Amino acid sequence: PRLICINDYEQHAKSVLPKSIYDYYRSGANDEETLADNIAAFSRWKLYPRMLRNVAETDLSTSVLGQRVSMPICVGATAMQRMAHVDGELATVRACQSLGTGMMLSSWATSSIEEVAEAGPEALRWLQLYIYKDREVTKKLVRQAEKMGYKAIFVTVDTPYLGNRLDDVRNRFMKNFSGLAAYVAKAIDPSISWEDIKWLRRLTSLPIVAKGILRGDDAREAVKHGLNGILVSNHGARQLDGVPATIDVLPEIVEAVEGKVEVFLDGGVRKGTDVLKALALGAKAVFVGRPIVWGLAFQGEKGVQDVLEILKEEFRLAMALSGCQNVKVIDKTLVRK
Amino acid sequence: PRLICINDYEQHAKSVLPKSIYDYYRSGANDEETLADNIAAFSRWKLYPRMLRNVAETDLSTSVLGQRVSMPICVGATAMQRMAHVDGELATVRACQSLGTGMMLSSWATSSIEEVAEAGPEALRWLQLYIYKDREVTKKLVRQAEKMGYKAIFVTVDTPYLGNRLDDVRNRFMKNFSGLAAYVAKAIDPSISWEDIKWLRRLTSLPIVAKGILRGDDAREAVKHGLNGILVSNHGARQLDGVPATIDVLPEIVEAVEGKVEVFLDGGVRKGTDVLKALALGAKAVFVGRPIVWGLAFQGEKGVQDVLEILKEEFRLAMALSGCQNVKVIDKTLVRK
Amino acid sequence: PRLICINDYEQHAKSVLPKSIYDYYRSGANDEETLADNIAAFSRWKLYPRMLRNVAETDLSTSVLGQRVSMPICVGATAMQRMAHVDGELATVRACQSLGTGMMLSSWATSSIEEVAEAGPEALRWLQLYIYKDREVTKKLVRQAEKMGYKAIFVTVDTPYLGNRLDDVRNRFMKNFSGLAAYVAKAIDPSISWEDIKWLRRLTSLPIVAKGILRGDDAREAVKHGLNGILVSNHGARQLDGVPATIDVLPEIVEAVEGKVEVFLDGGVRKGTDVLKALALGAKAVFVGRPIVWGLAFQGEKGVQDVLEILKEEFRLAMALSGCQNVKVIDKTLVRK
Amino acid sequence: PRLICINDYEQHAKSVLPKSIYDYYRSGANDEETLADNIAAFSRWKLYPRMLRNVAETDLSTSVLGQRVSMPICVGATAMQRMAHVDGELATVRACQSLGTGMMLSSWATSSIEEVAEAGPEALRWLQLYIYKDREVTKKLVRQAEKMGYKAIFVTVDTPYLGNRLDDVRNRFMKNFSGLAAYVAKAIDPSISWEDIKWLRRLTSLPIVAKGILRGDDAREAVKHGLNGILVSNHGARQLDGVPATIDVLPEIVEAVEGKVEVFLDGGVRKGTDVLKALALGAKAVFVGRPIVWGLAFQGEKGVQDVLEILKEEFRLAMALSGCQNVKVIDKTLVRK
Ligand SMILES: Cc1cc2nc3c(=O)[nH]c(=O)nc-3n(C[C@H](O)[C@H](O)[C@H](O)COP(=O)(O)O)c2cc1C
Ligand SMILES: Cc1cc2nc3c(=O)[nH]c(=O)nc-3n(C[C@H](O)[C@H](O)[C@H](O)COP(=O)(O)O)c2cc1C
Ligand SMILES: Cc1cc2nc3c(=O)[nH]c(=O)nc-3n(C[C@H](O)[C@H](O)[C@H](O)COP(=O)(O)O)c2cc1C
Ligand SMILES: Cc1cc2nc3c(=O)[nH]c(=O)nc-3n(C[C@H](O)[C@H](O)[C@H](O)COP(=O)(O)O)c2cc1C
Ligand SMILES: CN[C@H]1C(=O)NC(=O)N(Cc2ccccc2)[C@@H]1N
Ligand SMILES: CN[C@H]1C(=O)NC(=O)N(Cc2ccccc2)[C@@H]1N
Ligand SMILES: CN[C@H]1C(=O)NC(=O)N(Cc2ccccc2)[C@@H]1N
Ligand SMILES: CN[C@H]1C(=O)NC(=O)N(Cc2ccccc2)[C@@H]1N
């Protein structure tokens, strides 16, 4: 294999993973209209590069909720990574610790909070949480993440029930505690409200990011409840089909929060120019989901490291060709839809 | 067969029904531009879901012209159901009586008004009517529907002549009284005017819905003639080709009637998110045509029951993932085109 | 063969005509972008039909430059019809005389002005003219048309040179006096100006229509020079590629002439709904080019008669389903783009 | 071979050139979204031709930076032409000297400045320059071009680093001094700023054109630094992917420079109507890149001459069919997007 872009990693993963596993990772909800649009929407945003700006020394570094990272490109929560590679999340956190970027650990990981911390003691690590009907286990997760050096909580707010991913049902298809639709119907609480966010905000002094916000009014409510960021996300197009692409709703959310918290994006990031467009529209950083899994499927830690390095170099080139020597000068005039 | 969405039922029906019968049911008029657009138009309307609203107890119930139904998803008139299954309309009305929803019986049914009432005595049942050149038979139908417990009349107003469905002519292709184009040219009155609506309004005290309205001015005229609802319909794209999708004209019609009557939609409903979008734009309920026929072709009553249950569950999930605990809170901010 | 729409006639013509002849008739200029758009543009204009208007007695009749015709659907000039059938233009004029519509005779016909008049003595007949470098032959044509009972002159104004139709060059591919590109470079005058229109206007008292106008300013100039109509035409997309579809420029031209002359359309008419849309946007009538040739290729006079009857019946149905009992009530609210 | 349009030359070049060489010449950056759009964008601009203007004597001549040319169609810089044909740039400059148009010589030519001048002593010739980390060699190039009769400098400003063309990396793929990405990383200066433009402006009294401007603000800065033209260019879509098509950004640049300098376009010119549209939107002339290489691949000098003659004749026809007797009357009302 000669894999030189993120799409090559997906094509390789399709060739080596059982169909059920590949389809678990690549599927979106229902007719997958949002899955296609998360990528198509990036192509509609055009770049207006500045020339002659001196880009000899391109600095990709930024910060996420106060913590320095090497690039505005971080690993999003994807469940059950050991299905892709025997090391799963441990390989992922080692690759993040090599790159100098952060890993968001899924609540449905095939590795424990304490195992991951130990594989990546110097890695920037966050916990993605669901509020479970069992609030005792929810609180136990939060208190384990605090003790194991995790630096934030990403609370997923778009999953009262699991989305309907047809291939998991059509294909006859967790170390911390569709079969997956039935699992959620059991553990995950569909009653969660803003009252539960008030509880979580009182539970921990860790930064909390609301993950899965698509509306400006909900983003303002998150700010009002004392949360510290918004991850503009449609859950990799796996929840409600027919929502907009995240790059299309990002500007409304950035406008609505009036600078009070950091805004992040995930969904459809596959190229350095996607990262650049997201930052031009006001995201502080982006998270990648599927590309990391294809990295694992190729060669575990090394495969994840290669995916993250291809993204980093593509982003560096896009910054340089656009006239941007650092992330602080990536401005809204770089893009038009 | 493992049929888990409405498209699967169509694919199965194509596999088991003679081509002429399948094409009778699936065909639209002329080049079928509206047939494609009835579905494509739903995909252009995007959903803006609210998070954290408490959707543990999702209530799908609503009412149609005063009568309670279990969900805002009802069976539209499709002629000649016994071509799809030996029980035809009797299977359909039994499935509606199990689901707690309504059946609109076609005037060109392969079962009699009195036979259907008897198969579904507790089912909510309406009659779709044409005004026939023979007004005596027209009046006999209305007076049979009143005596047999039907709760409304859906008068079809878009069919002075039958549309030109090419496959019926190219394929060498009624218990109440193209060969079908020639049948209409004989029975159906092309002279029908608003004067005939005044006659029908005086004929019966049953609610009357005008079916096949596409213009706001015609919707206002229906209100002025004392009708009790508008079914925004292009007749499943089988009459005039090149009219807009019904989801696209729905907002104009809702605006034009100023709340005075209920507005319904049919045409292209195949998914729970289609139902949600129609309700967000002000429809009280939607009617499904073809999906019921594919249910019959699969397994008669059980097949219709399965189609209606897939629609119900998809709608429940779309409501929950959008933050809607009941139909009364499905609002216009949920959608944008 | 079972040919029930105009597209079927084209498919049959492709099956029976030598490739060079078929490609001569079906080709557009260069990459054929306008050829595709002449048809695609009709599909973008949507119909908003009125219900319940009494369409029992649909009257398709209208008039063209004062002369009654049975329908607003007339035969446009297409050169060299005997390549499609041994009777060529004589078959075409007999079919027009049966239908009660008009024939525009090409200046590059394979039959003489006096032969056509004689085959269709009761047919409504017009002459399409080019202003030839030889003004004596130009004047001889006009004076023959006047003597043989032709009722107008359609002067083609978009052809100073012939368009570049690639297949005629790639395929190694006139009774009144690319090899065809070379013929024009010889006979047709590229110097023609509005001064030449003044000459033609003084030459004959016959109505004169300017054929091939695409701009409102040129349409106003035609009115100022005392011409009696505008045929909005891109020459069947065979001249300048990348001009708009004729249905898209029709409203600008109708607006610009302020009712002073009749406006006609050709280019991409294949269905009754195309005729209806053109009339809703203010055309008095439309001309069909290629469909007549496919009629000839099928069965000469009978094939042309069948094409014209399919168009007539499709138009009658579209009028009836739109609520229009006659052409005088086809209004601009029937369409929206 | 029977090659009658520019696309035919590309298809022939694909048939005769090794895949690595063909892909070097035809590739764009990353997913090649801009490569497709450079051509698609021309098709969206529609032509509104004037009739009856007298186009018997069509004059294509114009001037570029003061020098007369036979047509507003000139040869752009494409590196390493000897890979396409044994004569490379010498064949190209001979074909330009036959046509009476200009050649822009690449800084990465497979022929020397003094060899090309000698093959085309009477040809209009310009030098495309990069500002190299080695300013001594940069100055040597400029002073050779001045001594050898070159009439301008086109300074490329969009290439601080080379774009990522995937096929050069996936295919295991200079007489004046991806392996090519690595070459640039060595010679080409990523620090170049407007200070370096001030240096180049003081270095030579030759006209200087800034090549690769996409923003109006950068075009105004070029005017302020005393440059004499802007070549609106995305480097044949080979640098930053996802920038707009050059025909789409051309009007902003023409507006921004307020007539102070000539504006040129390259990127996606393949047809005479492309040239016409560019001139209608205010370009003085256009440059062709790839089409010249396909000319070489076919038959060296004769192949380049044939490509340039097909462009000239297509442009002459498009001018004539649009009503334009010379370039001075090609106005903005000819086009609408
Ligand atoms: C296979 C898979 C598993 C996921 N598991 C989780 C999860 O456990 N928790 C969560 O909050 N999001 C989960 N997501 C959503 C991701 O965090 C993220 O929103 C999404 O992958 C981003 O889009 P992308 O895959 O296009 O980069 C998952 C996504 C995928 C594809
Ligand atoms: C096979 C078939 C038969 C139909 N028969 C009738 C009919 O008898 N009366 C009527 O008013 N509408 C009739 N319709 C129109 C339907 O009531 C309804 O408007 C349409 O099916 C809704 O679109 P859908 O099939 O996309 O759900 C028929 C539609 C189909 C597909
Ligand atoms: C084969 C062919 C020959 C034509 N010959 C002539 C001609 O002799 N004179 C003329 O004015 N227009 C000519 N035209 C243009 C037609 O009059 C008319 O504008 C065009 O066919 C209308 O478009 P349609 O073919 O899509 O119906 C010709 C078109 C075709 C396809
Ligand atoms: C094979 C190839 C080599 C090129 N080499 C150079 C170069 O050496 N210097 C430069 O400034 N531009 C270079 N360009 C960009 C061209 O000057 C020009 O901007 C582009 O080819 C125009 O687009 P077109 O190929 O669609 O006509 C190159 C383009 C191609 C395709
Ligand atoms: C369905 N994929 C995930 C997702 O998108 N969000 C989430 O919470 N997951 C946990 C999970 C769900 C089903 C089965 C096992 C684990 C996902 N894997
Ligand atoms: C043509 N399909 C129907 C329709 O769309 N509307 C209607 O009234 N029908 C009655 C019917 C028509 C033809 C032949 C038999 C019955 C339809 N089946
Ligand atoms: C090229 N087709 C025609 C057309 O569009 N307009 C016209 O005047 N024609 C005369 C003609 C042209 C070439 C060869 C023979 C005759 C056409 N046939
Ligand atoms: C990459 N193609 C070129 C281009 O677009 N711009 C440029 O300066 N080139 C010089 C060059 C680059 C790589 C290898 C050899 C020579 C190109 N050939």
Coordinates of N, CA and C in Angstrom, one line a residue, chain A residues 128-245:
Chain A
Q128 N -15.2 11.9 26.4 CA -16.6 12.1 25.9 C -17.5 11.3 26.8
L129 N -18.6 11.9 27.2 CA -19.6 11.4 28.2 C -20.9 11.4 27.6
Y130 N -21.6 10.3 27.9 CA -23.1 10.4 27.9 C -23.7 10.5 29.3
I131 N -24.7 11.2 29.5 CA -25.5 11.1 30.8 C -26.4 9.9 30.8
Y132 N -26.0 8.8 31.5 CA -26.6 7.5 31.6 C -27.8 7.6 32.5
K133 N -28.8 6.7 32.3 CA -29.9 6.6 33.2 C -29.3 6.4 34.6
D134 N -28.2 5.6 34.7 CA -27.5 5.4 36.0 C -26.6 6.6 36.2
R135 N -27.0 7.5 37.0 CA -26.2 8.7 37.3 C -25.0 8.4 38.2
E136 N -25.0 7.3 38.8 CA -23.9 6.9 39.7 C -22.7 6.5 38.8
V137 N -23.0 5.7 37.8 CA -21.9 5.3 36.8 C -21.4 6.6 36.1
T138 N -22.4 7.5 35.7 CA -22.0 8.7 35.0 C -21.0 9.5 35.9
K139 N -21.3 9.7 37.2 CA -20.4 10.4 38.2 C -19.1 9.6 38.3
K140 N -19.2 8.3 38.3 CA -17.9 7.5 38.5 C -17.0 7.8 37.3
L141 N -17.5 7.9 36.1 CA -16.7 8.1 34.9 C -16.0 9.5 35.1
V142 N -16.8 10.5 35.5 CA -16.3 11.9 35.6 C -15.2 11.9 36.6
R143 N -15.4 11.2 37.7 CA -14.4 11.3 38.8 C -13.1 10.4 38.5
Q144 N -13.3 9.3 37.8 CA -12.1 8.6 37.1 C -11.3 9.6 36.2
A145 N -12.0 10.3 35.3 CA -11.4 11.2 34.3 C -10.6 12.2 35.0
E146 N -11.2 12.9 36.0 CA -10.5 13.9 36.8 C -9.2 13.3 37.5
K147 N -9.3 12.1 38.0 CA -8.2 11.5 38.7 C -7.1 11.0 37.8
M148 N -7.5 10.7 36.5 CA -6.5 10.1 35.6 C -6.0 11.3 34.6
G149 N -6.2 12.5 35.0 CA -5.5 13.6 34.2 C -6.2 14.0 32.9
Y150 N -7.5 13.6 32.7 CA -8.2 14.1 31.6 C -8.5 15.6 31.8
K151 N -8.5 16.4 30.7 CA -8.6 17.9 30.9 C -9.9 18.5 30.6
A152 N -10.8 17.7 30.1 CA -12.2 18.3 29.8 C -13.1 17.0 29.8
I153 N -14.4 17.5 29.8 CA -15.6 16.5 29.5 C -16.3 17.1 28.3
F154 N -16.4 16.2 27.3 CA -17.3 16.5 26.1 C -18.6 15.8 26.3
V155 N -19.6 16.5 26.7 CA -20.9 15.8 26.9 C -21.7 15.8 25.6
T156 N -22.0 14.6 25.2 CA -22.8 14.4 23.9 C -24.3 14.7 24.2
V157 N -24.9 15.6 23.4 CA -26.2 16.1 23.7 C -27.2 15.7 22.6
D158 N -26.8 15.0 21.6 CA -27.6 14.8 20.4 C -28.1 13.3 20.3
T159 N -28.0 12.6 21.4 CA -28.2 11.1 21.3 C -29.2 10.7 22.5
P160 N -30.4 11.2 22.6 CA -31.4 10.7 23.5 C -31.7 9.2 23.2
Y161 N -31.7 8.9 21.9 CA -31.8 7.5 21.3 C -30.7 7.5 20.2
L162 N -30.3 6.3 19.8 CA -29.3 6.1 18.7 C -30.1 6.3 17.4
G163 N -29.3 6.9 16.5 CA -29.7 7.0 15.1 C -29.9 5.6 14.5
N164 N -30.7 5.6 13.4 CA -31.0 4.3 12.7 C -30.0 4.2 11.5
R165 N -28.9 3.4 11.8 CA -27.9 3.2 10.7 C -28.3 1.8 10.0
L166 N -28.9 1.9 8.8 CA -29.4 0.7 8.2 C -28.4 -0.4 8.0
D167 N -27.2 -0.2 7.7 CA -26.3 -1.4 7.4 C -26.1 -2.2 8.7
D168 N -26.0 -1.5 9.9 CA -25.9 -2.4 11.1 C -27.0 -3.4 11.3
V169 N -28.2 -2.9 10.9 CA -29.4 -3.8 10.9 C -29.3 -4.8 9.8
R170 N -28.9 -4.4 8.6 CA -28.8 -5.3 7.4 C -27.6 -6.2 7.5
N171 N -26.5 -5.8 8.2 CA -25.4 -6.7 8.4 C -25.8 -7.3 9.7
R172 N -25.6 -8.6 9.9 CA -26.2 -9.1 11.2 C -25.2 -8.6 12.3
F173 N -25.0 -7.3 12.4 CA -24.1 -6.6 13.4 C -24.9 -6.0 14.6
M174 N -17.0 -3.2 25.9 CA -16.8 -1.8 26.3 C -16.3 -1.8 27.7
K175 N -15.0 -1.5 27.8 CA -14.1 -1.8 29.0 C -14.3 -0.9 30.2
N176 N -15.4 0.0 30.2 CA -15.5 1.0 31.3 C -16.6 0.8 32.3
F177 N -17.4 -0.4 32.3 CA -18.7 -0.5 33.1 C -18.7 -1.5 34.2
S178 N -30.1 -3.5 15.2 CA -28.7 -3.1 15.6 C -28.6 -3.4 17.2
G179 N -27.6 -4.2 17.6 CA -27.4 -4.5 19.1 C -27.1 -3.2 19.8
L180 N -26.5 -2.2 19.0 CA -26.0 -0.9 19.5 C -27.2 0.0 19.7
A181 N -28.2 0.0 18.8 CA -29.5 0.7 19.0 C -30.1 0.2 20.2
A182 N -30.2 -1.2 20.4 CA -30.8 -1.8 21.6 C -29.9 -1.5 22.9
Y183 N -28.6 -1.5 22.8 CA -27.7 -1.1 24.0 C -28.1 0.3 24.5
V184 N -28.2 1.3 23.6 CA -28.5 2.7 23.9 C -29.9 2.7 24.5
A185 N -30.9 2.0 23.9 CA -32.3 2.1 24.4 C -32.3 1.7 25.9
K186 N -31.3 0.8 26.3 CA -31.1 0.4 27.7 C -30.3 1.4 28.5
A187 N -29.1 1.8 28.2 CA -28.2 2.6 29.1 C -28.5 4.1 29.0
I188 N -28.7 4.6 27.8 CA -28.7 6.1 27.6 C -30.1 6.6 27.9
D189 N -30.0 7.8 28.6 CA -31.2 8.4 29.1 C -31.9 9.3 28.1
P190 N -33.1 9.0 27.6 CA -33.8 9.9 26.7 C -34.4 11.2 27.3
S191 N -34.4 11.2 28.7 CA -35.1 12.3 29.4 C -34.1 13.5 29.7
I192 N -32.9 13.4 29.3 CA -31.9 14.4 29.6 C -32.4 15.8 29.2
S193 N -32.2 16.8 30.0 CA -32.6 18.2 29.8 C -31.5 19.1 30.2
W194 N -31.7 20.3 30.0 CA -30.8 21.4 30.6 C -30.7 21.3 32.1
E195 N -31.7 20.7 32.8 CA -31.5 20.5 34.3 C -30.3 19.6 34.5
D196 N -30.2 18.5 33.7 CA -29.1 17.6 33.8 C -27.7 18.2 33.5
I197 N -27.7 19.2 32.6 CA -26.5 20.0 32.3 C -26.1 20.7 33.6
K198 N -27.1 21.3 34.2 CA -26.8 22.1 35.5 C -26.2 21.1 36.5
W199 N -26.7 19.9 36.6 CA -26.1 18.9 37.5 C -24.7 18.6 37.1
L200 N -24.4 18.4 35.9 CA -23.0 18.0 35.4 C -22.1 19.2 35.7
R201 N -22.6 20.4 35.5 CA -21.7 21.6 35.7 C -21.4 21.7 37.2
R202 N -22.2 21.3 38.0 CA -22.0 21.4 39.5 C -21.1 20.2 39.9
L203 N -21.1 19.1 39.2 CA -20.4 17.8 39.5 C -18.9 18.0 39.3
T204 N -18.5 18.8 38.3 CA -17.1 18.8 38.0 C -16.6 20.3 37.7
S205 N -15.4 20.6 38.1 CA -14.8 21.9 37.8 C -14.0 21.8 36.4
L206 N -14.0 20.6 35.8 CA -13.3 20.4 34.5 C -14.1 21.2 33.4
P207 N -13.4 21.8 32.5 CA -14.1 22.4 31.3 C -15.1 21.3 30.8
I208 N -16.3 21.9 30.4 CA -17.3 21.0 29.8 C -17.6 21.6 28.4
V209 N -17.6 20.8 27.4 CA -18.0 21.2 26.0 C -19.3 20.4 25.7
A210 N -20.3 21.2 25.1 CA -21.5 20.5 24.6 C -21.2 20.0 23.2
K211 N -21.3 18.7 23.0 CA -21.1 18.1 21.7 C -22.4 17.7 21.0
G212 N -22.6 18.2 19.8 CA -23.8 17.9 19.0 C -24.8 19.0 18.9
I213 N -24.4 20.2 19.2 CA -25.2 21.4 19.0 C -25.2 21.8 17.5
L214 N -26.4 22.1 17.0 CA -26.7 22.5 15.6 C -27.4 23.8 15.5
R215 N -27.9 24.4 16.6 CA -28.8 25.6 16.6 C -28.1 26.7 17.4
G216 N -28.2 27.9 16.9 CA -27.7 29.1 17.7 C -28.3 29.2 19.1
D217 N -29.6 29.0 19.2 CA -30.3 29.2 20.4 C -29.8 28.2 21.5
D218 N -29.6 26.9 21.1 CA -29.1 25.9 21.9 C -27.6 26.2 22.3
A219 N -26.8 26.8 21.4 CA -25.5 27.2 21.8 C -25.5 28.3 22.8
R220 N -26.5 29.3 22.7 CA -26.6 30.3 23.7 C -27.0 29.7 25.1
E221 N -27.8 28.7 25.1 CA -28.3 28.1 26.3 C -27.1 27.4 27.0
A222 N -26.2 26.8 26.2 CA -25.0 26.1 26.7 C -24.1 27.1 27.4
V223 N -24.0 28.3 26.8 CA -23.2 29.4 27.4 C -23.8 29.8 28.7
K224 N -25.1 29.9 28.8 CA -25.9 30.4 29.9 C -25.7 29.3 31.1
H225 N -25.6 28.1 30.8 CA -25.4 27.0 31.8 C -24.0 26.9 32.2
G226 N -23.1 27.8 31.7 CA -21.7 27.8 32.3 C -20.8 26.8 31.6
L227 N -21.2 26.3 30.4 CA -20.3 25.4 29.7 C -19.2 26.2 29.0
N228 N -18.2 25.5 28.6 CA -16.9 26.2 28.2 C -16.6 26.0 26.8
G229 N -17.4 25.4 26.0 CA -17.2 25.3 24.5 C -18.4 24.6 23.9
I230 N -18.5 24.7 22.6 CA -19.5 24.0 21.8 C -18.8 23.3 20.7
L231 N -19.0 22.0 20.6 CA -18.5 21.2 19.4 C -19.7 21.1 18.5
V232 N -19.7 21.8 17.4 CA -20.7 21.8 16.3 C -20.5 20.5 15.6
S233 N -21.5 19.6 15.7 CA -21.4 18.2 15.4 C -22.8 17.7 15.0
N234 N -22.9 16.9 14.0 CA -24.1 16.1 13.7 C -23.8 14.6 14.0
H235 N -22.8 14.4 14.8 CA -22.4 13.0 15.3 C -22.0 12.2 14.1
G236 N -21.2 12.8 13.2 CA -20.7 12.1 12.0 C -21.9 11.6 11.1
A237 N -23.0 12.4 11.1 CA -24.2 12.2 10.3 C -24.8 10.9 10.7
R238 N -24.7 10.4 11.9 CA -25.2 9.1 12.4 C -26.4 9.2 13.3
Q239 N -26.9 10.4 13.5 CA -28.1 10.6 14.4 C -29.3 10.9 13.6
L240 N -29.6 12.2 13.5 CA -30.8 12.7 12.7 C -30.3 13.0 11.2
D241 N -30.8 12.2 10.3 CA -30.4 12.5 8.9 C -31.2 13.7 8.3
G242 N -30.6 14.5 7.5 CA -31.2 15.6 6.9 C -30.9 16.9 7.7
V243 N -30.1 16.9 8.7 CA -29.5 18.1 9.3 C -28.5 18.6 8.3
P244 N -28.2 19.9 8.5 CA -27.1 20.5 7.6 C -25.8 19.9 8.0
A245 N -24.9 20.1 7.0 CA -23.4 19.9 7.2 C -23.0 20.8 8.4

